[PDB]
Amino acid sequence: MFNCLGMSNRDFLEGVSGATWVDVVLEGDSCITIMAKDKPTIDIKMMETEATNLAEVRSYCYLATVSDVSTVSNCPTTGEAHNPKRAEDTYVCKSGVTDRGWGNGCGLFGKGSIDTCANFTCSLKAMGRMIQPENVKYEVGIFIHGSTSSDTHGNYSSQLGASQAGRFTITPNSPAITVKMGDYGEISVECEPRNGLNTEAYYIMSVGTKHFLVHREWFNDLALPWTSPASSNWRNREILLEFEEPHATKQSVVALGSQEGALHQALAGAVPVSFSGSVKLTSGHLKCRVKMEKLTLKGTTYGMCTEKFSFAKNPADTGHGTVVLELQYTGSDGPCKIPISIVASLSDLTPIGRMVTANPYVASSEANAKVLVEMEPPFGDSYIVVGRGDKQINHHWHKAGSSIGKAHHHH
Amino acid sequence: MFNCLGMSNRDFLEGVSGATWVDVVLEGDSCITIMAKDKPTIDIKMMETEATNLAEVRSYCYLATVSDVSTVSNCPTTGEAHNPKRAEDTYVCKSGVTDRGWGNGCGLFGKGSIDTCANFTCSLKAMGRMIQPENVKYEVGIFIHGSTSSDTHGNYSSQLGASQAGRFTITPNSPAITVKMGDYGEISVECEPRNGLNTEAYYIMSVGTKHFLVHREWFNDLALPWTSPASSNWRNREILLEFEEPHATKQSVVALGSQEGALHQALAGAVPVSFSGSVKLTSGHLKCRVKMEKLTLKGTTYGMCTEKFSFAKNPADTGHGTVVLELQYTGSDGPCKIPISIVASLSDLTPIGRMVTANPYVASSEANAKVLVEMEPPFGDSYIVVGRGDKQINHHWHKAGSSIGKAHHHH
């Protein structure tokens, strides 16, 4: 979707009289319709958020195995013990003093030395990757409620071609942007990413079959053996190793148990992510100020359409307290403004309610044009009326509800 | 090998005065010579460890492919979507709600339903098998250092026939055993398998061309799709599947990437094994207590041999600080005890050193018998002397080393 219509995850905001900005929250899967006095209605929504060229920060080991454990030992006065496995970098080595005597095969009594080494291999590891702010693009779609039909309204190519839709990019570095709006002037947008979209606060951690957005502080403080992205030999290998109390000529080295369970429990709350090479960020939101003082209706204005209309599609409930319909216009006098309104009584034509599709018009000079119109009728019974006199058509509508005030369940 | 001689992987233990047991570690490829006061010297070693009738525990999938992905979709009020592929068990199916409207071909606006299915096939799997304790035999060989020759010493048939060798089985269920020792009384042996021989701690995992001894806890916690040995349809197939965000009438289903690399890295430390139908366990060891209070020299004792000896084989270094030789006896007065000793000087015949082949004797009544003798000479110069007076033969020996104490490199 590049527009608000048809979406269930949709909100409506008002640009009230005199307001020069509207504050919005843009989620990955939602859409905002903004209606404002003497301005075209506009939709704004997040289209996509992608981050390219993730860089490794560090990898941690959460299950180690030990192998090839050996101890070199020397009786007192016979020199210090050195384990030759000290040459091989995958071995962790530990020097020690031992009590020696006749009983343990040494002629003299006193301190002997030992040097025990053991081969370190990581069984299970988790990688952390980071996102550079210069490699993040937040794609935002804008739609202007100009003339559309049921066929053209959700067609991006058609809307882009009528200068009624477009796509702009917001970045962590360039969070402000002025977007031209065809014949409607321009808007200015400034956003701040929050939660899952504030990539400065997180790393992507790959564990097992999954990838997770994880808080940087927690990842950095993980007390596990680790490797740098370059020069990969495990550091702090001693965590997960237990050098047991040594005997005179031998020493046992055992791996600690797996920390995988503790890891999974740490990741239970975290948002899973997919394909960390060009990751798609779904969670979180942008907090944006849409400045609209230069958003304007079109300088070229029209007269009213004079010929007759019919309902090409009868009013339908959108689920949002609004109704949408499609008119077909017989006249060839376009472009022209559509004489459509909502009234309480066919005997009293005072307009009530509100048009979502503000200033509806036929765009085409050709006959039989189709125009979609979305409107908010009042609570109770009303009539959608198009035209006047003996060209008038109308359709009754009933909207459930009251003005007392809606309960909400915000998430 | 059923005996210690000729092996490089050999250790010597002492049954000291008053000790009623000796504690030993039996590895798959090593041998222990035990010398003890007023007892025959004995060898003890692991002969084989085999496990029969392994049973499958579970199999895991570490690379899945998806195929025949399809979605059935329904507009609002038109009923719930059901995918008929829900009948076929190899399909994973996922129900969903979608936003519907004119734009996506539905007359009414509201929630439509979808039902997407996809065929699951495992590309690469690993099987885990378990060993019942009742199907494990640890075979242990015992040799008594009775009279032998260079020809008979390593001949099992000859040694079994002289009641100087035998083979007994230790099992996880029956880890204790009393073994008769011919005319030497008996010993009692009790063992505990450790590491690679403690089959209660492991499963055999078949991956690719290889089989590995793997820790049970790690295998059981593997978060991959799995099948029971019976009723084989994959469970937890959803791991390795990604149902992508659905469009109105379509939904993409993709397999996750292979977990083979993570698997190989998990198996890098593990001990490889061969032929898991009757697997041979090589790695690990038995920790055994050899009780020897009823081990005894033979009740039938001999006088000294009176006739002359010659060296059929000159003393040879075994590599263990011991020397082995072969005498040939001219006399027909056997069986008789051999008058052999180690001395510092031919002018002073005080015995020094130690006989590995304790109480050497000629077993045969026939002439020209050959008797192997292994002995530990002191550091420095010494003489091996056989016989007395003008029947005396001797051979000088030099042993490098000192009594200060040997450095060791235990593994």
Residue numbers in the entry:
A (entry chain A), B (entry chain A): 0 to 410
What does the article say, verbatim?
In this study, we reported the atomic crystal structure of USUV-E in its pre-fusion state. To gain insight into the structural features of USUV-E, the ecto-domain region of the protein spanning amino acids F1-A406 was first engineered to include a C-terminal 6xHis tag and then expressed in E. coli. Via crystallization screening, crystals of USUV-E that can diffract to 2.0 Å were successfully obtained via the hanging-drop vapor-diffusion method. As expected, USUV-E also folds into three domains (DI, DII, and DIII), showing an extended and a β-dominated structure. As expected, a head-to-tail USUV-E dimer which resembles previously reported flaviviral pre-fusion E-dimers could be generated via simple symmetry operations. In this dimer form, the highly hydrophobic fusion loop is readily concealed from the bulk solvent by the DIII domain of the other molecule.
The viral surface envelope (E) protein functions to initiate the viral infection by recognizing cellular receptors and mediating the subsequent membrane fusion, and is therefore a key virulence factor involved in the pathogenesis of USUV. Structural investigations on flavivirus E protein have revealed a strand-dominated fold with three β-barrel domains. In mature virions, E protein assembles, in a “head-to-tail” mode, into pre-fusion dimers, shedding the fusion peptide from premature exposure.
